[PDB]
């Protein structure tokens, strides 16, 4: 068993945490694994859960929390157009190569 490519690249595979990227911030376009795209509206820890959370606004109806969760609110826009996921569930999009 030997393919064309070969070699190791030890980088990150020991300390797995919820590190919050630098690009992550309010007014920043991003995408999710299974939650479509959405702009960041909130970025900070929670009260019910530990770690760091990221409020992503979904232009389309497919979220869970209508701006607030378990009482406490973070962002308000419309019922059925809000969601809050961890940084791990958020990636940079930077869409708009030519058009907008």
From Swiss-Prot:
The organism's superkingdom is given as Eukaryota
Transmembrane residue ranges: none
Describe, from its UniProt entry, the tissues in which this protein is expressed.
Answer: Ubiquitous.
Where is the CAP-Gly domain positioned along the sequence? 44-86
Where is the protein localized? Cytoplasm, Cytoskeleton; Cell projection, Axon
Q: How does it assemble?
A: Binds to DLG1 and DLG4.
Q: What does this protein do?
A: Involved in reorganization of the cortical cytoskeleton. Regulates axon formation by promoting the formation of extra axons. May be functionally important for the intracellular trafficking of MAGUKs and associated protein complexes.
Q: Which family does it belong to?
A: Belongs to the TRAFAC class myosin-kinesin ATPase superfamily. Kinesin family.
Protein known as: Kinesin-like protein KIF13B
Q: Which organism is it from?
A: Homo sapiens
Q: Which residues of the full protein are shown?
A: 1685 to 1771 of 1826
């Amino acid at each position: 068993g030997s393919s064309g490519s070969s070699g190791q690249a030890l980088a990150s595979d020991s300390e797995e945490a919820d590190e919050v990227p630098e690009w992550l911030r309010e007014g920043e376009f991003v995408t999710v694994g299974a939650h479509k795209t959405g702009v960041v509206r909130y970025v900070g820890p929670a009260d019910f859960q530990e770690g760091t959370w990221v409020g992503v606004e979904l232009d389309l109806p497919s979220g869970k929390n209508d701006g607030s969760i378990g009482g406490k609110q973070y962002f308000r826009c419309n019922p059925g157009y809000g969601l809050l996921v961890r940084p791990s569930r958020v990636r940079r999009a930077t869409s708009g190569p030519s058009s907008g």
